[PDB]
């Protein structure tokens, strides 16, 4: 039984919001709803009506939504539900809504705000210290407030705001094994540099090592000086500025030589975590850096022909294995050749 | 007959330097020497001796060498030659040194400063407006000055400085044809996505179109939505800060579909010039942006096991062809796969 719960009271002692979670799982097929409870104080309400909202929104300039001096903002969703005076809709309470209701008492009014399937998940771009202002990403916010009319300035102490998150999971099995053969033919004649990278599965979760079986067969006269397997994260902003970023989030090298007429076989273990990329800036995270529950951003996925500008940021990951061949181009020069496999990265299934 | 010549007089009317060129060709095998002439005025010299220097040097912080407020500087070469009073070395004058000598008269003393083969060519990184200070690169400078002792402060008006450049050429023939087969095997069974990019040659010059013959054979159930061929420039700084940059300097897309059981054949024409990349910042050039004779930086080349930190910046270019397949990873998602060929980019042979 989960004993933990998130709550915040409006600083006029009028409204108060109570959530079980802050992180809601997008299962691709469906999304977890925001089942919550709102407390009221009819005396201090002063005959004002109370509503609850759910706002998904892209921002650009600052970290959070509720901050002065944004460069751009574009709400991607809005909902509203009157909780007091209550439009009498006695729906079945969730097991979480029971826990929150009993403790409070009679002035506890449940609610359920739903999530669309066209929205992205939570994503944030931590900017470089110098380029502070490039900061952008998608945010989510539950908010409750007391009001009379529907077109009024909501006062400082009337409102109450909880920053929530949307995180993405999907099953990795049953799934195939991605493979990539490739054969470079430099020079006269037909003597190829064969490379063969492969994966065990297409989906991966934060914390999971990513095994890449490499298989080189060097028929050329020239030698392979280094072999290296990496995880690259590409980020594409698709609102306001539309910037582009790329980061190596994991890397493992092999300084072993692979000369002519030789063959190489090794399985690299790559582990892209934020832990080893804290110092790195201009990187796509699924939250704020200071928070502990933050990881690298999940793989964005676009269905059919959805408006790309909706997603806010497009994050994708790929494996990349790179051979560093001595000679090849130039009499005495080291050149590089690579081959890239894409994969999905997501948040693991919560307990 | 070239009627043009570069000259600058020290603003004490003491020393003056006269060059035919400012751009000297590194032919990889050899380098063009700095054949020049120096003018003197024995009366105003005031019994001071005159020398001529050739200084290759990396810098970081500003555009030029002769500027106040550098963050880092590391000279990579230094030479000196006394021209007055002349150590009597009557060597044969070049055809260029003749032209400069006759016009001046009796006070014209020729000189020849040589270039090592361990030095890089001219390269510069134009920083972003925001990140001004990332500016770095290799510079070259001919300098003459009048002095008494060898350990004195050279005065403002005694010295004279000409910023010169070192540019790299090499022959493209006789040469092979780079090719790259690659075969992706996603999903169960054995149905591959075949891609085959190829080049006509390995060396290319500024201004020359780069033809890439692409050849797709889609045996998989899924469709290829887009095909794209690009030129990527990677820059690696190897002194002081050691930053990393990557830029698409040329791009050509093909929105033609390539469905299952189908085949694609087309030759893309890519043309990486600075003209189409002026707006782009954090890009490796072979000079200052404001100058007209500037292009994209040439391909750096490292021989045997040279100290990489000598070159200052490591610039490399590659062709990249990218297939954008619908489906593949995810039920209804577009993923990408690519294959990369390296090539050499250099300055063309001067007239």
């Amino acid at each position: 039984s989960r004993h933990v719960m998130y709550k915040k009271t409006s600083r006029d002692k009028a409204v108060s919001v109570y959530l079980g979670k802050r992180d809601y799982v997008d299962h691709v097929d469906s999304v977890e709803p925001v089942d919550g409870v709102v407390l009221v104080d009819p005396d201090l309400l002063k005959g004002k009506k109370v509503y609850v909202t759910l706002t998904c929104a892209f921002r650009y300039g600052q970290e959070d939504i509720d901050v002065i001096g944004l460069t751009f903002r574009k709400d991607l969703y809005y909902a509203r539900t009157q909780i007091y005076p209550p439009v009498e809709d006695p729906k079945a309470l969730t097991k979480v809504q029971e826990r929150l209701m009993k403790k409070l008492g009679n002035n506890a009014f449940p609610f359920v705000l739903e999530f669309p399937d066209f929205l992205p998940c939570s994503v944030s771009l931590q900017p470089a210290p110098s380029d502070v202002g490039k900061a952008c990403g998608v945010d989510f916010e539950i908010k409750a407030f007391s009001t009379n009319n529907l077109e009024d300035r909501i006062h400082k102490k009337n409102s109450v705001r909880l920053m929530i998150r949307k995180i993405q999971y999907a099953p990795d099995q049953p799934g195939p094994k991605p493979r990539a053969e490739t054969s470079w033919q430099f020079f006269m004649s037909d003597k190829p540099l064969h490379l063969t990278a492969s994966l065990s599965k297409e989906v991966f979760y934060h914390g999971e090592p990513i095994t890449v079986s490499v298989s080189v067969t060097n028929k050329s006269d020239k030698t392979v000086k280094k072999i290296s397997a990496s995880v690259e994260q590409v980020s594409n902003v698709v609102l306001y500025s539309s910037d582009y970023y790329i980061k190596t989030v994991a890397l493992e090298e092999s300084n072993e030589k692979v000369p002519s007429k030789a063959s190489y076989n090794h399985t690299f273990s790559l582990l892209p975590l934020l832990a080893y990329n804290r110092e790195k800036r201009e990187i796509a995270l699924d939250g704020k850096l200071k928070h502990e529950d933050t990881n690298l951003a999940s793989s964005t996925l676009l269905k059919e022909g959805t408006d790309r500008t909706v997603m806010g940021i497009l994050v994708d990951y790929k494996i990349k294995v790179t051979l560093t061949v001595s000679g090849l181009l130039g009499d005495m020069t080291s050149s590089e050749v690579s081959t890239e496999l894409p994969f999905i990265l997501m948040h693991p299934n919560p307990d």
Side-chain angles (χ1 to χ4, degrees), chain A residues 1-150 152-160 162-186 188-325 327 329-330 332-351:
Chain A
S1 52
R2 281 74 166 180
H3 299 293
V4 187
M5 35 161 301
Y6 307 75
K7 54 174 174 179
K8 187 179 177 179
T9 308
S10 69
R11 290 170 281 95
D12 64 346
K13 307 297 181 181
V15 186
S16 186
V17 288
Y18 297 75
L19 299 176
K21 308 175 184 180
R22 293 224 293 180
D23 300 350
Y24 298 103
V25 179
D26 183 299
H27 329 264
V28 180
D29 54 63
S30 64
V31 183
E32 286 183 353
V34 184
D35 59 297
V37 180
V38 176
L39 192 80
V40 294
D41 187 3
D43 294 61
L44 282 179
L45 279 184
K46 200 72 175 181
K48 296 176 183 180
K49 306 190 176 181
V50 178
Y51 301 77
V52 189
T53 63
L54 163 64
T55 306
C56 178
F58 176 102
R59 43 84 190 177
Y60 195 109
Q62 307 296 118
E63 294 177 56
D64 206 66
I65 296 295
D66 188 7
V67 288
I68 194 171
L70 288 183
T71 314
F72 179 65
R73 167 166 184 179
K74 179 176 172 62
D75 299 0
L76 310 182
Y77 181 69
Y78 192 108
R80 194 171 63 264
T81 297
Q82 190 190 4
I83 66 94
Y84 192 78
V87 63
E88 210 290 298
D89 291 59
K91 299 181 180 180
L93 281 79
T94 61
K95 188 182 176 185
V96 178
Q97 283 175 302
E98 289 178 59
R99 297 170 214 167
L100 298 180
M101 168 168 92
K102 304 304 178 182
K103 297 293 184 179
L104 295 180
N106 305 302
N107 304 295
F109 299 76
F111 74 88
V112 176
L113 305 192
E114 290 292 306
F115 271 119
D117 300 59
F118 67 79
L119 292 186
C121 292
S122 294
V123 61
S124 177
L125 180 83
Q126 300 297 301
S130 59
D131 296 0
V132 63
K134 300 291 183 180
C136 67
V138 168
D139 297 2
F140 294 76
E141 178 179 290
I142 306 302
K143 185 179 179 181
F145 63 110
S146 57
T147 185
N148 291 296
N149 299 300
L150 299 180
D152 288 357
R153 174 204 136 75
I154 305 166
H155 302 125
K156 296 297 188 183
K157 53 179 173 183
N158 288 8
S159 57
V160 53
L162 279 181
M163 278 289 311
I164 70 165
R165 296 203 308 175
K166 185 171 172 287
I167 68 178
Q168 198 156 54
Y169 164 95
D172 70 80
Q173 288 299 301
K177 295 187 176 182
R179 288 188 63 266
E181 295 174 57
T182 180
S183 303
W184 296 284
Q185 281 276 10
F186 87 107
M188 269 182 86
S189 190
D190 55 303
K191 57 207 308 160
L193 178 67
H194 286 347
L195 174 66
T196 297
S198 62
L199 292 178
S200 62
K201 56 195 189 74
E202 78 293 354
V203 165
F204 285 97
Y205 307 111
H206 300 126
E208 192 182 9
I210 303 167
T211 59
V212 189
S213 287
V214 181
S215 179
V216 187
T217 290
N218 185 2
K219 311 289 284 187
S220 297
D221 291 302
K222 303 297 182 183
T223 295
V224 185
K225 282 185 163 171
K226 193 197 295 183
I227 310 176
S228 49
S230 68
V231 183
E232 288 184 358
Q233 182 204 68
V234 174
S235 306
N236 265 294
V237 180
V238 291
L239 279 181
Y240 184 67
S241 70
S242 189
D243 315 305
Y244 170 103
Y245 302 102
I246 179 169
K247 299 293 164 178
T248 302
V249 294
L251 170 69
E252 180 181 300
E253 297 186 3
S254 175
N255 295 298
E256 186 170 6
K257 308 295 182 178
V258 179
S260 182
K261 321 306 292 183
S263 303
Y264 179 76
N265 293 289
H266 175 235
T267 307
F268 292 76
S269 179
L270 290 79
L271 185 70
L273 269 74
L274 171 60
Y276 307 130
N277 300 298
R278 276 308 210 94
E279 76 293 358
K280 297 183 189 295
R281 296 277 158 279
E282 306 188 307
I283 182 170
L285 310 184
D286 69 347
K288 301 185 180 183
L289 186 72
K290 62 189 179 180
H291 287 59
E292 199 202 17
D293 54 307
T294 305
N295 306 66
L296 298 179
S298 310
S299 292
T300 315
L301 57 97
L302 293 169
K303 295 182 183 178
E304 183 67 1
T306 306
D307 184 8
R308 288 162 66 264
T309 64
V310 171
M311 290 314 211
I313 311 183
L314 301 181
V315 180
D316 75 74
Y317 294 75
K318 77 195 75 173
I319 293 293
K320 180 186 177 192
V321 183
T322 303
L323 304 186
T324 310
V325 287
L329 300 195
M332 288 174 80
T333 310
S334 298
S335 59
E336 289 182 358
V337 294
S338 303
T339 196
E340 299 175 356
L341 280 177
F343 70 105
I344 310 297
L345 185 76
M346 267 171 312
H347 197 293
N349 183 240
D351 300 298

